[PDB]
Amino acid sequence: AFELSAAEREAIEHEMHHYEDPRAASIEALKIVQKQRGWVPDGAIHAIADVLGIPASDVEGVATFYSQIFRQPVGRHVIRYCDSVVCHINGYQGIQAALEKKLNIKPGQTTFDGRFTLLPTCCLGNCDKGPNMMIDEDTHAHLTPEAIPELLERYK
Amino acid sequence: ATIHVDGKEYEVNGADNLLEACLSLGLDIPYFCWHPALGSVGACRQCAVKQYQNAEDTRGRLVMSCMTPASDGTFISIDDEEAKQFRESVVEWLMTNHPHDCPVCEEGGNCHLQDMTVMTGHSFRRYRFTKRTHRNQDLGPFISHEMNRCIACYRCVRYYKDYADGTDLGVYGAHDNVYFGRPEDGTLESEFSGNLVEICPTGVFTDKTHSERYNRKWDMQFAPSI
Amino acid sequence: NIIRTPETHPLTWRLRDDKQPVWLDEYRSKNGYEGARKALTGLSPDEIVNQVKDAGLKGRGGAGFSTGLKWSLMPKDESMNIRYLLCNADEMEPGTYKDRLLMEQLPHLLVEGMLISAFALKAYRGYIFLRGEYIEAAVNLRRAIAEATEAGLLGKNIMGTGFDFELFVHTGAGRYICGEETALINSLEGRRANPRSKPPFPATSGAWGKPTCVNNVETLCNVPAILANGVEWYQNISKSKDAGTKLMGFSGRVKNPGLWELPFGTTAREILEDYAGGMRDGLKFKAWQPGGAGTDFLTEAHLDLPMEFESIGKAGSRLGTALAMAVDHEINMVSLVRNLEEFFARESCGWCTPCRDGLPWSVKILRALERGEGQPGDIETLEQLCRFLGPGKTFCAHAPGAVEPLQSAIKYFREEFEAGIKQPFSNTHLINGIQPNLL
Amino acid sequence: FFRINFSRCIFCGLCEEACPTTAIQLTPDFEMGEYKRQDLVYEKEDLLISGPGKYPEYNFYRMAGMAIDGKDKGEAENEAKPIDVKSLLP
Ligand SMILES: Cc1cc2nc3c(=O)[nH]c(=O)nc-3n(C[C@H](O)[C@H](O)[C@H](O)COP(=O)(O)O)c2cc1C
Ligand code: SF4
Ligand code: SF4
Ligand code: SF4
Ligand code: SF4
Ligand code: FES
Ligand code: FES
Ligand SMILES: [Mg+2]
Ligand SMILES: [Mg+2]
Ligand SMILES: [Mg+2]
Ligand SMILES: [Mg+2]
Ligand SMILES: [Mg+2]
Ligand SMILES: [Mg+2]
């Protein structure tokens, strides 16, 4: 069972009056609910749909369209490396290999215990600076396959 | 109100799109996402016709019939080689991911996708790779759900939500993995959901009441009743 | 190093040395909000728009359309008193990193440019449609908005004249298609980010059925200097037909990657070897993209033409964000083009068939070609995708640009594509009792 | 029920040519000449042979896209496993 907390419901209701249409707060409501819990559970869809005033179908379409609104159980510290043209050139492949050799998983999976999900991301908009990756909200650039272990040991 | 289609000169209502006017004149243009009740959206890209100007532009540009205003000084050509090839390749792209199951589809001899595939003259598969697959939902005791056969034309969603105001059907996902169904298994609440069995051009939504005791369209015997 | 001066470096000139942002006090100190004050208390709408049209400012997002015409398109009638100005801070393009600099280190520049543009447009609200992966940028933008609000630069009665312009920030989830001009509007409405057909243009019916002009970050950063220093000064920065300054940079394995502000007539070789340093220690130049990923490759011969819209447009390619990428010799072209097409295919939306269903086919063909399992008719099938995904065949501009690096790499390096075709075309599986139809 | 009127069948072979699942075939053997003409109407029980006929290894349902007891949604020939829209991958 799912029910919206008081803090996140209040934040959604405060976001709903930044726009002319309540619907417009849908992405921000999903991001609030995800911030609190790490992902958007199946009941959060209907809860947000009841708070805003739009159906659960629209909220579920918004949540499954965008790639940073997780609809499946994701660990903590959702690692997102970049694999686009500028990074492909700078060698993000070695960075992905040293990441999935240390986490012992494949891109798209949790590790064992609910920490260090591994995902690829479109581009982090920091191309001139080596292969990049974000862990949760910290952008890490100039990545070297030697410094992946020590950089992962900072997140517990 | 006087368009030129392949040299011929017709008289049309200048207030509707070129697909509507050309279909009213009796010509044959393929189209998946247009419906004369749900307006025109340019999604499927399958009703492409070459459009010239000056009556002497020998190098027109491909444009969708359902989205051009069909004004007075309009010169198009449905049969242009480039337009033919694009319309054909457009169905080939849809056929890249289709399921090899016409024989077991609820609607053979009644499917619009079959009509348009035979119409665009495409009977050869160059695709070689895997097809995307989808899991079905339980939509009720009335209509079935086979998302493997979806061509993403958006007719179901447009009708069900913008026309009939359904509120429990939409589109999910993106990037060739798009999905059209309910947010969760369950019966469809809208009173007018049966029309999804004929709005959908493919055999994604097909009624169960006929699927139990099935018979191909040719075998049926109809009569005008109320 | 570079000697910045307010004359030649209107954007990058105030940027303090230690990379920390420039807050409201230091900004105003370095002649900040002077252009906004001039525009608000010495000009009027329909005059700022003409000043921007005469200055010749052009779209810095990648399209290249004139900003003055963009703003003029707005309807002229006071029956529509609710208008929106949306900054396109969503910067997703594999190779562009220019808005990060601007709205991380100079948030007040963007705030003031947006204030001036929303006064010119008679818009009461402004939404900075942010990226989401820009954490520090969002923090700095919100801090700058709060400072300008507390200091009178934002709010109901802005510096005497009656003009409200409440300014908001919208950090969205990560999809590249929301960068599109009229898909950004959908995403801001809280819907799925699907583009919209034009006409009607966003200028006449946009955000919520109201008028709306979507502008990039650099375009809007360009305006404060135009108003503050004058229209002629901006007209005369250099003798090129694209007036103003531009953020240009070289990405890739160059000796000093980054971005700089250049007079918009600079040859691409003058950025690679003078500023960016050149290929580094043992690497050899092979090709380059002018602008973000989504522009045509160019060989070494095209390295001397000036970086402007008309020159690179006539050279086959197109100047996008003017942030080049240098591809060195050690990069297989088929692998690189596969890495680009899989992004362009996975990052699409589902609306139109040519993009949604034809880009994955190209991705699979390129994977087979780079694995060594190509077959006759593959390159001739890729080339057919570059003609049928071009402009006009698809609903938006995502696929026309998605298929530009593919055709541009085929043209120049067909040998690296053919080298992958090592199989006999076969598609059937030889059913036992049926005899195949021969050729 | 499957029923074929053998008092009308001209043995053209058009049926076998149309069957997309290779179910019905024409085999080298003649029908007995019945006594009543009613007994010339075969009703599936008579027709269903025990074997695969001329084409030994063809299995239509190994090609079809819809699920049966044997194969699931992603287990057909030249098909990919179904990716859920609620996935995490971009
Ligand atoms: C697929 C696609 C993605 C785009 N992404 C961006 C983007 O990330 N940032 C941007 O400023 N413009 C982007 N644009 C260009 C915008 O549509 C729009 O023209 C621009 O943001 C604002 O116009 P301007 O260049 O005149 O300022 C994109 C266009 C397309 C077709
Ligand atoms: S939807 Fe039409 S084309 Fe597709 S399998 Fe069914 S009958 Fe064949
Ligand atoms: S389910 Fe049917 S109507 Fe809906 S998009 Fe797919 S093919 Fe079109
Ligand atoms: S080309 Fe079509 S499918 Fe691709 S992003 Fe644009 S509208 Fe969506
Ligand atoms: S061969 Fe088949 S199709 Fe032809 S007459 Fe006999 S039963 Fe009818
Ligand atoms: S391609 Fe990785 S940071 Fe841009
Ligand atoms: S029917 Fe016109 S684009 Fe689909
Ligand atoms: Mg009409
Ligand atoms: Mg199933
Ligand atoms: Mg089921
Ligand atoms: Mg779903
Ligand atoms: Mg149907
Ligand atoms: Mg506009």
Coordinates of C-alpha atoms in Angstrom, one line a residue, chain B residues 106 141-144 197 206-215:
Chain B
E106 CA -8.3 -12.1 -34.9
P141 CA -14.1 -9.2 -20.7
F142 CA -14.9 -7.4 -23.9
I143 CA -11.7 -6.6 -25.9
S144 CA -8.3 -8.4 -26.0
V197 CA -11.7 -2.8 -32.1
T206 CA -9.9 -7.2 -30.8
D207 CA -13.2 -8.1 -29.0
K208 CA -13.3 -11.3 -27.1
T209 CA -17.0 -12.0 -27.7
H210 CA -16.2 -12.6 -31.3
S211 CA -12.8 -14.1 -30.6
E212 CA -14.4 -17.0 -28.8
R213 CA -16.6 -18.1 -31.8
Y214 CA -14.5 -16.7 -34.6
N215 CA -15.0 -16.5 -38.4

